[model samples]
Target: MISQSIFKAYDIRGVIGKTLDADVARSIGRAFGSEVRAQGGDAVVVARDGRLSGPELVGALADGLRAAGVDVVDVGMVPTPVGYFAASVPLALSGGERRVDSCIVVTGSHNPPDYNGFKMVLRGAAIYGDQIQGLYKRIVDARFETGSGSYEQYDVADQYVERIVGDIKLTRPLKLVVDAGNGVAGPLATRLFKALGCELVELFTDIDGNFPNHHPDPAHPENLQDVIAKLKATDAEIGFAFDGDGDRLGVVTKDGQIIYPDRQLMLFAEEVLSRNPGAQIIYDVKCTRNLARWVREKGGEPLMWKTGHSLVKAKLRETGAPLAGEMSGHVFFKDRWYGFDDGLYTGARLLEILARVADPSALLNGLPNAVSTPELQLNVKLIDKLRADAKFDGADEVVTIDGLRVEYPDGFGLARSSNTTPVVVLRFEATSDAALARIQDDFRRALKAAKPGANLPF
Candidate 1:
């Protein structure tokens, strides 16, 4: 039986050799492949990131899939987004012999190097929430289809790069810095951006599973210090940082200021809404409240959904929204490209818009500004109690779509328990310092009431 801990709300992930191993990966592949067979699909694409354990896990996963009579198209080491691109189409368009759908990505995805897991899409739908739990149940039942199948290798990198470079037209080349943090995105991102005609100052382009320079996660400001420093030594107008699997993007200006993803969405939405008026724009709850207002003011419909990337993608499909983004740096563009989150592609789109003006940072910094705190994690107890009792005296109301988002007239405070861990996460944003303090104080009082000695990160 597989570890129950490996099954998560969004995807299957756990420490590689602890909660996950070759046998565990094989069982998951078998379980997933059984569903593919039941769905009448004969082939599935498998890809992995640069983690050292990836090759072994992929080998075992393919074995299990082939055992279930599902042909495997192994797209060797690439970022998670690249794996998604490989699975988003039919083989006929690429002149392949058989029709193939569905994909499995063996990526830890911004997690520590010791961690690795799978992200799956079956029949073009992201399997999450109950769907993920279903995989575990199937495994426990030992209900797997059995048959000897086939295997082959495929490379979709060239086509992916061609598609992006051809789609984006830059007014002029601009000097830019890209830091991959030694993850799988470095090589492809560097290649893709250079092809787009940007003068580049590249960092950590080598694929190293150890991640020697810096952690691949960009959600924390400390992880972006390297790229921010690079912008100073060079004449690059802006800097871009990519997370481990290349699904999240982190942007930094030449002046050492970070452009949070919510703000970046404003720019992307402004451009997308100009071409797609009356379109719907989706953003996750962790994003600033300013995004919805900005979208509405720009003649677009703003929809705030749950925080997970898979959930946002599902919402985008349900609404046919041309664009969607999350505060964690996942940007999905159905406007001119695929809707799957791709950090490198988002950076490319950013460049396409910025190239119109000489002052790129000026344009980025000019977006809606706010006093916001980065996502904060806490080990506080009684999360449910706090959520049920928290009060915002003069706020509009609390949004409970994903968590408690106390919406004030000028700011908001959020507290939600982490889906993957025994911790609570919080965030705050306001129009002014006083508003921010008032919101935080409201949360503080609620926290004290829930657990008198809770350690607050604020």
Candidate 2:
């Protein structure tokens, strides 16, 4: 029997030989294929990362999908975005120009090397929250579609790279250091950068599922240590890092400073707004307060939505926003390219802008600044009730779009319940240290008043 815990709020993931295995993968494939068929989809795209367990799991998943009467186009050993690129286009298969309505990528993402999972797309949309739970229920009900399906192998890398190279026009070549953390982004990144005439100082670009050099996630400061050091040691003007499946990005300056994704959106918004005036630019609530103001100043509409990537993507589709991003470095651009979170593609776009400037770091570093705290999680619950009862006395606006983002003239404070964990995530920012502390105090008092003797970890 498949473990119920394998299904998550955003995607399906579990540690290998524990909550996930070939058997469990096969069952999920069957359930997914059955659902796709019910929706009149006869074909799906399957791809995988460099993870060691990827082949076994994908093999099983493909078998299940074929058993359910849906054709499978397997793009072997690629990043998640490549799979997305394949899914977005009409494939010229044996039949002339057949459109595939579903895509599945077998990847563990930033999880530990022993872990594996699937990020899926069905009928041209990301399924999360209640939709994910419904997929689990389908498996439990033994909903199996009847018929024999077909499977084939295909290569989309050359075309994908050519598309980016054609879209991005760099004014001049620039020196860059790219650290892949032994994930699947290494080879494709190398080819893409070289194609664009970038002078590259590569680090850990080899595809090793063991991830020997460092963890594949660049969101954490510790994971960016090597890239930061490399940028400082070399004459490279900037550094870029990618996660295991290459859907997220981490950026570092020549002086070893990490330019978080929210700030990067400031630069992206500026360029995108120049071309598409009045376009909607969406960002999550977890992003900096500076983004909304930046977008507005650039003559674009800024929309703040929920925090999850799936949620942000859904919002982008609904709003037809040209650009969207998260604090965690998932940037989606539909302005000059198809909208999907590709860290490798994001790096190219960032470079296209930087190539015009002599001081890339200065251009990036000067975007904006504020006194802020990294995300901190405390063992707390009933956060929604706390948000409902929150009273920020001097705040300008109390945004409860995802949770409570108490915005003041000087700064903001946020307290949102974690979807996958039991803790309450907290982040505070202001013009000064004193203001930051004051905002935290406001949250502390509110939480205590709501629940007497509540444990406060601020």
Candidate 3:
């Protein structure tokens, strides 16, 4: 019995034994295979992360895929980006030559150890939103074609590493540290960084599914404590951290300050815009307003869009944006590579940019800084109330692309519903502490007006 809740807005995810199991995985494979066949594709690439249930789930998924007349190319135990790369690049199968028709990455992506899920790409585009919902319907109806499709093993790790090394070259050798948090990026990260001539230090690179060192998510400050400690202990110029699946990145400087993705985009925009002037630089709404100013100053157009990796990728395709990023550490580069979010690739690109400068930390800190509040999650009821009442006390304008964003001359505040969970996400930024307090008070009053009993976490 597959739970319908597993079919989320971006991808499918659920707790292993309770909400997701081998049986549910097989059904998903059958449904996904049918969709591939319907789209005129006969081959699918499948990969899994370092979860304990990986082998069982992969076997069941392949079984169902083959049953639906779609051949499965199983790339065992790779990070999520490597799975996407395998699908994008052609494969050398035993019998013949063919491009992957689709790809499925089996990962929980920063969820607890007991959780596992799938991020899918079909026919060169991420299968999400309505497509994901349709998959659930197909599974419930048991709608699948019948044929004995074959399965084969292929290792694309070497090719993936070589591909990255071929494009990126370091200006000079620099010391760095990587905290994998016992995720799947250990082996590939070691090879990739070494190939680029970086003096590297590794932390928790082992493929431990339990994530015993700490939670694999780098978005939380607690998860990055170890990396910060190591940065101070060693002479490393910078540090990089990856989530459980290696799709999102967290960066730290020599001074132990976290460099969020939005600020990182400023550096990337400068480089990309120099090469392709007047290019469109896309960023999510949650990003700092400074990004927009920086892009315009670089003679590039700034586009603010909804927040989601898949959604941002789609916008990139539509606008031909050279780069796009989110506050959650997902960066997409269309400048010199496929426009997918790869944490390893983003780190390499960051290093490439920093190596040209003398002081890495100073160069990063030099980007326009502002007093900002960390993203806060609130009850859905209060979020809806805030959304309904868009008028604020002190605001220049309100932008309602994905949520209510009140813009003041000094700073901005955002209140929006999270697509993945039953909560509202809030963020604020200002030029000074006084302005920050004003914005916070505006939100505070708005929340109280909506629900007097609501618990506020500010």
Candidate 4:
């Protein structure tokens, strides 16, 4: 039986042996297959990441799909987006029959090694939220269809690379450093960038099931220390780091300064708005408030929405927004490319933008300053957790979307619960470091009232 805890808001995620097992995976596959059959989609594509439990889960999933009389095209190890791409990419059988129409990616994204999950696409629409939860419930209640299913092996990584190279061309040769973090991105990194005529310096480019160099998450600054050091040593023009499945990215400037995703989104927003004026640009609640103002200044619509890749994608389709991004580095561009977060694809797009510009830092530095902090990790209880809260004397306005975001005179602070982990994520930014500290201090006062025992280094 599948563990109920694995059923998240958008997808299934859990630890390998404890919250997830092969038996449950098979049941899910069968249930998903039955759901697909009901929707009249007879063929599906299945891909996995480099996690240890990936192969076993996929095997079980394939078994379940076959039992439901659906045929699965196994695309081996690939990024989550590639599996989503394969749903639309034409696939032919030995008899020249098209057999792919939907897809599933077994990945935990940037989560720890012990975790794994699934991303689903059905009939060109991403099946998330109630759909994902309903699938799991169907399996638990023994409501799955029973039929003979079959499987086939296919490779689409080369096609994914080629598609990216086709859309991007550099005006001049650019040197870039890439830290694949020993995830699945390692093997394909050199080939794709080299095809675009980039000078590539690769670090931790190994497909180790165990991420020995460091944890694959790039959102955490500590996880990017190695890449930043390499960028300084090599003197590369820019650096990019990928999470475990290559859905998110972490960027570094030539001077080895970390450019957070919100800043990166600012750059992308400007370019996209220029091309599609008056278009809708969606950003998550955790994104800097300036993003919305900037979008409006550029004559584009700005939307502040919830976090999560699947959640963003659904919002994109609902509003027909051309682009959307999260502060955590999940950038989705529906105008220039497919509306999904592909780290390699995003890197190519970033390079394209860089080639057109003379100065990159200026683009980042020009944005309005807020006393915002990079997401701060604070341990909290899974149930009745308390958090540090500080008071802002002249706090202008407050936005309590996912968490508390208080706007001060010169900056703002945001505190929210991490969807994927057991911690509260906090950030503060201001026009000056002193102002930043003041905003942070205000947050501390509020947090102390919420959770008296909370400790903060800053």
Q: Of the candidates shown, which would achieve the greatest TM-score relative to the real structure?
A: 2
Tell me the tens digit of each residue's lDDT in model 1 across 313-334: 9999999999999888899998
lDDT, candidate 1, at 239: 93
lDDT of 2 by residue, 71-118 (tens): 999989899999999998877666567678689999999888999999
- Report how far residue 117 has shifted in candidate 4, in Å: 2.2
- Count backbone overlaps in model 3: 0
Model 4 lDDT per residue over 67-174, tens place = 888988999998677787677667655556574767888988878888898888877777777898888788778898778877788887777788888888888767
TM-score of 1: 0.95
444: Cα error in model 2, Å? 1.5
- In the order shown, the candidates' Cα RMSDs to the true structure are 2.0, 1.3, 1.6, 3.5
State the local distance difference test value for candidate 4.
0.79
Clash count of each predicted structure = 0, 0, 0, 24
Worst ten in a row by lDDT for model 2: 378-387
Steric clash pairs (candidate 1): none
Give TM per candidate.
0.95, 0.98, 0.96, 0.88
Q: Which 10 consecutive positions of candidate 3 have the poorest summed lDDT?
A: 379-388
lDDT by residue (tens digit), candidate 3, 288-406: 97998999999999999999899999999898889999998999998898888999999899989999988999998888889998888774566667767645886988888877888
Clashes of 4: 24
lDDT of each: 0.88, 0.88, 0.89, 0.79
